[PDB]
Amino acid sequence: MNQVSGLAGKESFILTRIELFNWGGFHGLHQAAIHQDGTAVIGPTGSGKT
């Protein structure tokens, strides 16, 4: 089921990348990549992961 997602990005605009600068507990610039077909954001409690 993973590879069928490729249609998104032709019929739609998909998410590609998110960045921050001095936001919350993230001092300075910060970055994060995202794949075309479903990802995850995992980490222990109290880490800004929301």
Added chain:
Amino acid sequence: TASLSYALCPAGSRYPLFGTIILDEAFSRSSHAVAGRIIAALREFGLHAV
């Protein structure tokens, strides 16, 4: 837990006579790292939990 421990303690004593405090489906917003604290604490107060 502290409250229900106190309320069951007979006057003067601080070891409750009834012991079996239940719980259910408790940890759905916490990590395995922090949940380990509660399990140890609960038994510490003197209770005994299914």
